Amino acid sequence: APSRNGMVLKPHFHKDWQRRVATWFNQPARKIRRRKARQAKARRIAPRPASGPIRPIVRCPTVRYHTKVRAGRGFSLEELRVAGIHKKVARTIGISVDPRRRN
Amino acid sequence: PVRNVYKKEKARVITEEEKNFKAFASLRMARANARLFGIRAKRAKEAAEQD
């Protein structure tokens, strides 16, 4: 079955892959759906901004990506206590609260 | 929310013997010290044991 000088191949096609084929023919469909979802959110919900809760300045845990920066998840309850406001009052102001993040 | 902070430190004069002390051998000495930290402590404990 093999031939002249070429790379040894091990394709993972022995399993019946013909049944489970997912091809993005609805990719502009999802694009239009999610545009309408964002616009309907900005209509119906509030004059709150899009991507409503504010995300923290957060460093990435690695020896690789720790030179860069990232929008995190929440404001790390010790930090919120130093800022001096209540938890759910902060959640209604717009502060994203994650109780797991340490300092 | 990105705010990639950019420290520059553009102007400084060439300085004293840090350029004569911060050579390649410091990394190898630190690597050897980190690899042989505990065995020296075991030899110190054995030197204290053998009186």
Add this chain to the structure above:
Amino acid sequence: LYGTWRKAASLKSNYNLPMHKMINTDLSRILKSPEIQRALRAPRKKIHRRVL
């Protein structure tokens, strides 16, 4: 939106105009210029057909 060959495009971020391969590309003007016709061999229009 595209610019000239001196500056870049101000609306598109990383685009410039293409490189122009032949600048003054009038081939008849080039072949009838005196600089080319100074260095030509001779007009050889003899045929030299088959002689029985």
Add this chain to the structure above:
Amino acid sequence: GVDIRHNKDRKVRRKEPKSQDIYLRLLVKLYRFLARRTNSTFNQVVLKRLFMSRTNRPPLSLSRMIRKMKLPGRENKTAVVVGTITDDVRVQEVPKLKVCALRVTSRARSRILRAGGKILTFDQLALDSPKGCGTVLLSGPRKGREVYRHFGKAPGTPHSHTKPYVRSKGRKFERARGRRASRGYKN
């Protein structure tokens, strides 16, 4: 029968350039006319290099195009390249030389115009030198291609130094039987 010899009809050659580029065809017409009307073997070789393929015209580099003119006797001469001259990150100083090439990259053109040189095209090179006087023709690193390092008699039979095909250059991929003496044979 007449010829007992084998019938090898066409030798090797590419007569017309396979590229459908109109500007390349106009340059082929102009340098064909000059090559058959000026008795210039420089025009012959430049017309053959215009017949030559896209792959067999490797991109020239700025440091090499400096160093081939740094030699004594190449001060007032023009560098003619049938191919592209690209930027080099290595060098810092660029002399006051002249360039005659096709499709020079933007950073290379910018640094030549900052250094004070003059870039040209092949029509201007023909108007300035029909026979090709004052020119030096250059070529680029063909054998440094990644494709040519797989080419040999074998990957490893007199150890052969010619890079077998594999996915990941590392451990567990083609390193055991024939690469070391402890596991079976060794080349």
Add this chain to the structure above:
Amino acid sequence: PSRLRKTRKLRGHVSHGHGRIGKHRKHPGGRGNAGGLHHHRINFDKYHPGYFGKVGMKHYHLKRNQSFCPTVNLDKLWTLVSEQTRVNAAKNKTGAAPIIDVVRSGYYKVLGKGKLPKQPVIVKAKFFSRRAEEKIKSVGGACVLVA
């Protein structure tokens, strides 16, 4: 393009490009890498040496994440900062030198090459080679270790 395909050109030949005698039916030699040791040893050997066997240690749960160290050369050491910067910083002003921080560029380890001019700089990196460190000491720069 089926009109550029060879199959349209071969319509009319009986065996269709695969011979009358050999008769390529389904899979004559095997399937995939069949017979890697038995009967295709002149193709697996002599074209892929080293293919069969174990080689070394088995590092369980390996990541290509802890050993992340992109190597920057001394030729690439200059153009991480612009040429205007080094000209206006080394235009005979004083003994001050510009600082090239390769960790900002994303390259961790500095290695040695040639083509390092006389004008000294300060290089901050996580790692160095002794060749590049001697080149920096030869051109008069300062080698600074950072974390």
Add this chain to the structure above:
Amino acid sequence: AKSKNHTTHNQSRKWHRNGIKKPRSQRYESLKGVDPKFLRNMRFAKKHNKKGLKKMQANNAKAMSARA
């Protein structure tokens, strides 16, 4: 099911299809295989040729240009 085992018929005609080629040319012949003590001679001799051939051959070139 006995078959023809081995022959060399129709082989030289296949050989002379391409005109069997001598290697025919190795200018400055290959150096591997020669005596390692001779290589320890020759490499040090070549690098000291690179070192110390300058001034004596220069004065000899001056002398032979003055004589002829």
Add this chain to the structure above:
RNA sequence: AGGCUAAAUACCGGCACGAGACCGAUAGUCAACAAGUACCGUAAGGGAAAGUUGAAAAGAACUUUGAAGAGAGAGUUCAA
């Protein structure tokens, strides 16, 4: 070692909808049509063939041979 929760994801079943560099009655679903119908096997089950008159039926009144099928005239229609 107790529990709930919308989101981005999937949908060859269903109800309605739109489009096609696809097929055009031996093709396309088995099925453009009284198709899961006729029919077969005790049964599970198997499973077809089959579109086209003309603009409009104005589907040839009436005479004549023959018991009729059918035919020769006449007539409608741009064209039997």
Add this chain to the structure above:
RNA sequence: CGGCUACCCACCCGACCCGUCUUGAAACACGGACCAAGGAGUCUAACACGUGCGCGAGUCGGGGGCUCGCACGAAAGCCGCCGUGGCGCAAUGAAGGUGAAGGCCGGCGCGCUCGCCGGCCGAGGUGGGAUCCCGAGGCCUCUCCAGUCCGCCGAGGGGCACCACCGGCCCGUCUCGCCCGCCGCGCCGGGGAGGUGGAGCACGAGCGCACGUGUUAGGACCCGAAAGAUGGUGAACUAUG
């Protein structure tokens, strides 16, 4: 009147019925009564090579986002402090790890089979090598004089692409030897000279797109079985209570 012609006939010569399996077919080898329609190398993924295009030490938005609700718009345009990421620019080791510049001149230590200081050049040398450059000399209706003019050339020089060899540098083992440093003097690190193995360096040529060939996995050029498993239906024939 002329006319080759898918019309018919006659005459002279040659002429076994096509396709394949085969060393060998007209075969007493097989398929073919005839005719109309259908019918067999496609597609995906991956790799390799060749070719064309754009950018080019970079390249690529395929993943999302932005525009007003548009049939063609399931298109197209843009992002750039969306380049995260794939490939390439660095390899060698099983690994801890390490990691590609040398050459010239002057001075010193006994220029010591030997290290250091100051300045300069910078990817080495040899033999070939398209091309290019300089040029003795010769030649244009009568004499000195001339500038471009018609006009080649012995010999000489610089030497792309690549070939063959030598030398140099990086990594892992092997052999022989001396020296240097202290965020701490230790079963601590580094350096030297040779012979080795590597898919290395020795001014890098890749990335994306598309086409062609070949291979592999997928039903995969089309048709073909004796067989195996899963779940159901039959004692109206027959066998026995």
Add this chain to the structure above:
RNA sequence: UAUAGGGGCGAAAGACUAAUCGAACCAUCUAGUAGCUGGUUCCCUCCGAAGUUUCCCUCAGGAUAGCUGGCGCUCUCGCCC
């Protein structure tokens, strides 16, 4: 009425089990696989083989080399040697 498929029943023939029994029938896996038969669809031009080395649980097969085609690249000549 009861025995239903590797099961049933058999005064035993491996006979019968719905025209099929030395393992029934229908559907699915399934377009199972086949180194094995048969076939494989327009024209013209150019070049054009082999039945051989070695290896294989190899002898109707495959891998390698050889034979072959295509794509080129580097040069050489046209102006007493």
Add this chain to the structure above:
RNA sequence: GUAAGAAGCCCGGCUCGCUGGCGUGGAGCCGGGGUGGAAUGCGAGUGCCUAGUGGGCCACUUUUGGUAAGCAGAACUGGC
């Protein structure tokens, strides 16, 4: 099988940690001198990718086994 030249001869000089009575030998490096060195014919070198092939037969000559074969098996060349 080898040789029938410019990749070949001759002269002068450096290097060697190889060798050693010896500037002895041997290799490498550098500079210079003269190319008209058998016949005949031909313009050459080199890189990549790949199909098919892997059942053969016959003939002169040399042969193996067999009594012999349109038998089986080898060598050169040619043909199918």
